[PDB]
Design a protein around this ligand. Sequence first.
Ligand SMILES: CCC[C@@]1(CCc2ccccc2)CC(O)=C([C@H](CC)c2cccc(NS(=O)(=O)c3ccc(C(F)(F)F)cn3)c2)C(=O)O1
Ligand SMILES: [Cl-]
Ligand SMILES: [Cl-]
Ligand SMILES: [Cl-]
Ligand code: NA
Lengths: 99, 99
Amino acid sequence: PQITLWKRPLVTIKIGGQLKEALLDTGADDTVIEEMSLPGRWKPKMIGGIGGFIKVRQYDQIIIEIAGHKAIGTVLVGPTPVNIIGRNLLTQIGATLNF
Amino acid sequence: PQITLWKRPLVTIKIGGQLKEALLDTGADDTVIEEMSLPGRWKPKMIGGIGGFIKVRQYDQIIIEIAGHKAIGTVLVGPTPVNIIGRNLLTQIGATLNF
Ligand SMILES: CCC[C@@]1(CCc2ccccc2)CC(O)=C([C@H](CC)c2cccc(NS(=O)(=O)c3ccc(C(F)(F)F)cn3)c2)C(=O)O1
Ligand SMILES: [Cl-]
Ligand SMILES: [Cl-]
Ligand SMILES: [Cl-]
Ligand code: NA
């Protein structure tokens, strides 16, 4: 689609068998999801943004469906105030900024 | 332009006659830039990001060039890891997210 930015660019995702709402965020290096269980191994990570840093769990090789488009990559899980799809997965669905 | 997301979407902005680098961030409602002098009065605001909330100074009706496009709108000044152009000015420059 072509998404205008008059409102927050929220889309439905599917991750870990669960349907969720998430924010498409061109400013985020990484994808970070509110607390949930994911299979496989993880390791701890600290990531920074406005407000400072949070500790998250880093799960690699996780498949997510974003607005109908399948991608795989690293997903971080931790106390983010909103689910965020960042550049590591936006590239895989061919997202661009256009003006 | 069409900007892909394999790297951070950094562009040149001009504010107050000074060139700066800023991040185009579709996950940001607002534009927040690092400490600098702006003209006029300011109002208080608190904004949230992934690490919690920060206090900023809100300046309205500020002239700012973004990647060669003119905008005139609200700029928040406060502690921020990078200068962020959010949706309030991305809409002024006609930006959309496409996939
Ligand atoms: C101005 C607030 C912006 C935002 C708002 C989130 C939000 C939305 C709705 C409701 C509540 C909150 C969105 C955003 O991109 C970030 C930052 C980047 C500026 C962010 C988001 C996601 C992950 C990170 N960490 S990171 O390691 O992937 C990373 C670190 C640094 C930068 C850098 F470019 F900003 F420097 C980009 N990415 C940061 C953030 O902290 O909050
Ligand atoms: Cl769960
Ligand atoms: Cl990845
Ligand atoms: Cl504005
Ligand atoms: Na894994």
